[PDB]
Structure formats: structure tokens, C-alpha cells
Amino acid sequence: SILFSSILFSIATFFSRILGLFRDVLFAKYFGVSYELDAYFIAIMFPFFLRKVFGEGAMSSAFVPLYSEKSGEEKDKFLSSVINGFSLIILALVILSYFFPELIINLFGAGSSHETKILAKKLLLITSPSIYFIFLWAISYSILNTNNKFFWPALTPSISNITIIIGTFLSTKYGIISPTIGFLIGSILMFFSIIKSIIKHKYYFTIKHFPHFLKLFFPTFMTMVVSQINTVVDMNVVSFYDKGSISYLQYASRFYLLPYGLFAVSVSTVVLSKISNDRKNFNYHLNDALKTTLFFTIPSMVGLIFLSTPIIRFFYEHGAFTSKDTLITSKILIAYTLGLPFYGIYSTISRSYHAIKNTKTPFIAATIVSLSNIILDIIFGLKYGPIGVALATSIAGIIGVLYLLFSVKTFPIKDFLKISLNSLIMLFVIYLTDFTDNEFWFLIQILIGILVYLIFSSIFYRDLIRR
Ligand code: NA
């Protein structure tokens, strides 16, 4: 029982990590880089952006306290208010979307070609309704958060991936609309997966509590918008360059995002819970988290940059994804990957501040990062295209972390220097091993790099290991 629960949950988490990668592999094989996939991304970008905002707690942060302070029927009324109000908004937001699709389109792919915008308009007819099920999924999620802190809903998004993957398999019959339908159905099934939390409540035909809830919800919602806006800006900027730019950024983003989610984000969740449970030792916990992030993100970066082309070719260069796409996506991946350690630090510091209820400093950091990213998007995007946009993302990350480090005034410098030294030693060794051109050699280079890095980590952290 107890053992079963743990092993099943761990399997589900592992597969959750794998499914995004597999979906992008299938996109590469079945669509490659094309205006069609660009239009798909434009069509799914607004609902995806909203789900990303709500997953960071934009809904929970305002809903949970206002919901908990209420009692009896009023509680349900509050819930109903939230459901009704947003539904109304969403309804308007869908109706307008049907009549003025250019409004939605120009937010994410203003510069894309005519055929791309026509196809994206077509796909919005399928993706716009998913916003409704995404909002309801979010609300359900919050209600659960009163019952238990986090739990499985974190894995409910996996549902979406499965359906999209299924759609991709069927695309040989129908084309891009099959993955788009897959996206919509996935949204609906997410909502159904956690629907129990709302379906147990009585429905009231009211928006009694909605204005007050908006008064408390809008500030936090906008902070999260700013914190998540960089991807929208990057997408809309590169939309002005040749077709497939959006798709290139997505493909490179996958391999940026695996190590980021595994090394940075997880450390950040741990530190948030730790500091929230043990506030008075803020510094200690923060330092610990920082060290951990640096221990994994610096070598990863090095490795990923050195092996970016064989990695991209191994995972993507099949079917519709060509060697040209490999070249371009490799360069973009390098540009993104220069920023990995900085965004790791950034995430850790931001969530520590959140752990002590400081929203101002994280919001200022996010503002610096987004402003920097748009400025550098214009400049470097004009000079270098998509690669310039990715590089702008990395540099903006650096600036943000400089602000956060000066603000929090704590950092494990000694461990940073040790980790950097080990990473350069590792790089030297794998450079020596790069003497043969084989499509699978990079896997043994990964093993060699890991071994060297761990050897020198065990040398330089011998006292810690012993104790
Ligand atoms: Na950028």
C-alpha cells in the first residue's frame, strides 16, 4: 500500500518529465519546422500562457485565503461567483476571439506570413474553448489546495501531452488540426480529472463576491503575467523573421527546459517549503539551495553547449526534421543554455523571497528581466535572428540574477569556484575525447564528463563527504 503509492507516484513523475520531450520528438518527426507548426504554436499560446500563469499560483494565491475565510453556503457562493465571473469574461474573450482573431494572433505571431495567420485563425476556433476548461481546472486545483498542499494535480498536465501526442500520430491522416484537437481534448480531460473538488459544491447563480475577488486577484495576476511574459515577447519578435522561427525556439527550448526543470525548479520547490516551514534559518536554506543548483546547472550547461549538435541530431533529426533544422536548433540551444545557471539561481532566490511573503523584490527582478529581454530581443534579434532572441533571454537572466544577488546579499562563492573549476576540467577532458564523428559518440562523452566531474567533486569535497 504505502510502498505502492510511493513507487507509482515516482513513476508518474518520471513519465511526466519524459512526455514533453517525446511530444517534441514526434512534432519534429511528423511536422519538422514549418509555417504549419508556427500556426499551431500561435494558436495554443494564449491558453498555454494562461495555464502557465495559473500553475505558478495566480489563482490559488487570491482564491485560497478568500475561500477559507468564508463558511457554509457563502463559501460555495464565493466559489460560484469566481466561476461565473471568469466564465463571463472567458465567454466574451471567446466571442471577440471569433470576430477579431487578428487581436489574439498579433500578440504571438504578428510578423508571421499570411498563410500562417490564416491557419492560426482556423486553429484558434479549436484552442479558444480550452481556456474555459483551463480556468475551471485552475479553480478545482485551488479548492484541492485547501484540502492538501499540492499532491497529484501537479501531474494532471501530463494528460494534455498524451492527447497531443495521440493527435500527432493521427496527423498523417488529418494534419496539424489533429494535434490542435488533441490540445483541446487534453484541456477538457484535465478539468475532468480534478473536477470532483468543484462538483461537490452547490451552484448559485450569482457573482456576489467577484468584484472583491478581482480586487485581490489582479495585482498577483499581473506579477505572474510579467514573470511569464518573456516567452510571448520572444515568440512575437521572431515571428518577423523567416517561417519556422517560432518552431525553432520551441525545439531548442525543450532541451533548455529539461535540465532547468530537473535541477533548478525542483531545488526551488524544496527551498520554498523549507523556508516557509523554517523561516528563521532563511539564509541557511537559501545557501543550501543555491549550492545544489550550481552543482548541477553549471556542468550541465558546459556539457549541453559542447554536445548540442549531436544531442539535437539524435533526438530530432528524423522524418520531417532535417539537418538544416539540426544546425539552426543547435545554435539556438547554445544561446539559451548560456543562461541556465543564472535562471537556476534566479528561481531559487525568487521562491525564497516568496517563502517569506516578499512579492516586491521578485516582481522588480522580473520587471528588470522582461524589460532587458525585450530591448535585447529587438537589438540582437535584428542582428542574429532567433539565436539573438535566445541569447537575449540568457543575458536578461544574468541581469536579473545580479539584481537579486545584490538584494539578498548571500551567495556560496567558494562552492561556485569549485564547481566552475570542476566543470572546466570536465570540459577539457571531453574536448580530448572529441576525435571521432559518430552519431552515438556523444553518449559516451556524457558518461566521461559525468565521471570526471564526480571524481573532482569527490576530491574537492572530501571533508564534506567524510562527515
Ligand atoms: Na529573448
Author numbering: 2 to 468
Quote the original article.
MurJ consists of 14 transmembrane helices (TMs), of which the first 12 are organized into two 6-TM bundles termed the N-lobe (TMs 1–6) and C-lobe (TMs 7–12). The N-lobe and C-lobe enclose a central cavity that is large and highly cationic, properties consistent with Lipid II transport.
Specifically, the C-lobe is bent with the cytoplasmic section swung ~15° towards the N-lobe. In contrast, re-arrangements in the N-lobe are restricted to the middle section of TM 2, which also bends inwards towards the central cavity. Notably, we observed unmodeled electron density peaks at the portal and at the central cavity above the thin gate. Furthermore, a reliable in vitro lipid II flipping assay for MurJ is still not available despite attempts by us and others. Based on the abovementioned conformational changes, presence of the putative thin gate, and the unmodeled electron density, we tentatively assign this structure as an inward-occluded state of MurJ. In the inward-occluded state, Arg24 and Arg255 are brought into unusual proximity (just 2.9 Å apart at the closest) on top of the unmodeled electron density. Since such close contact between two arginine side chains would experience unfavorable repulsion, we reasoned that they could be stabilized by electrostatic interactions with Asp25 and the diphosphate moiety of Lipid II.
